[PDB]
From Swiss-Prot:
This is Scyliorhinin-1. The keyword Secreted applies. It is found in: Secreted. The lineage of its organism: Eukaryota, Metazoa, Chordata, Craniata, Vertebrata. One of its GO terms (cellular component) is extracellular region. Keywords: Amidation, Neuropeptide, Secreted. The keyword Secreted applies. It comes from the Eukaryota. Belongs to the tachykinin family. The modification Methionine amide is found at residue 10. Tachykinins are active peptides which excite neurons, evoke behavioral responses, are potent vasodilators and secretagogues, and contract (directly or indirectly) many smooth muscles. One of its GO terms (biological process) is neuropeptide signaling pathway.
Amino acid sequence: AKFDKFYGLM
């Protein structure tokens, strides 16, 4: 899931 990766970069 790339959508969950976005939160990790946030």
